[PDB]
Amino acid sequence: DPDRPHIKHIYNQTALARNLRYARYGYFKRDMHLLDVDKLVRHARLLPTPGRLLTDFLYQRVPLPDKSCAALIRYQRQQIEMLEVWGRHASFQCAVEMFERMIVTNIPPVEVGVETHGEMVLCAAACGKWEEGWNVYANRARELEKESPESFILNTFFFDALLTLCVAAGRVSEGIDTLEEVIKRNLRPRGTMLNKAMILYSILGEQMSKHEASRYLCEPEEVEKMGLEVWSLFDFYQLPRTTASIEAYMRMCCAFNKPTLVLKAQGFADASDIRLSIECFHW
């Protein structure tokens, strides 16, 4: 198993037991009905375009679940991540074309679930399309949720994708509304969700500082009351602190002009175990 191997050094470079050539795509084309596309995207060599991967999957007529569609759009999303900033539109057109193929084919059995919509929202977050991710895909996922409950339920991954879209698009209030919708749905959020919420509160605090230097809520003294309580949500459920949590908390406290909380957080990072992450020294 490529994720949980029972041997060290899976591959080798010997003369007769050489197995790197047998790890490429095509040896796993023999069994595509039993295949896992997540490990196929992660562990394979010489993979084609994800549009051609979807063409080969639908050509073999295999019943793709939501995990397969999520893995193919995750492959397209990793292609969006690796490209330059000025070349993101064509890969997003490939993503929307693959999504259309996943919608309208209907034989072999292919269903679009919440993970596929979350991957499309993450694709629009990587491309930087607010009007395409929030207005089209998030609204379509919410319509599919409110139309057919008990089989299409929004998990934490979809709202993490929404918070990533609100951070990459700069939209502050929508991310706080999605975190409040996470809270009101009685499910715990991830740590990265609170990191994105602290980043959005930092953006709001910096905008309020620029607006008061130039001359929803125009009272800044309550905003820290809404900010530092996001730090209180880490000790609320379980939510262990990581490096990006310390980064977002120090950025939020620097946006709120409170250096004592930054000097407290830099000591709290050395308390249990946090690598101190030189941008933390910048803040």
């Binding site: 069994d31 009905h33 039993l34 295949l35 896992d36």
Partner: peptide, 26 residues
């Protein structure tokens, strides 16, 4: 997680053919 039993059947069938190589011709 559901397609591991058929993969196990293919692997044990391949091991059975490797043991069939002991028979030689026919």
């Amino acid at each position: 997680t559901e397609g591991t039993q058929e993969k196990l059947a293919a692997a044990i069938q391949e091991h059975v053919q490797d043991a069939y190589r002991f028979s030689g011709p026919t």
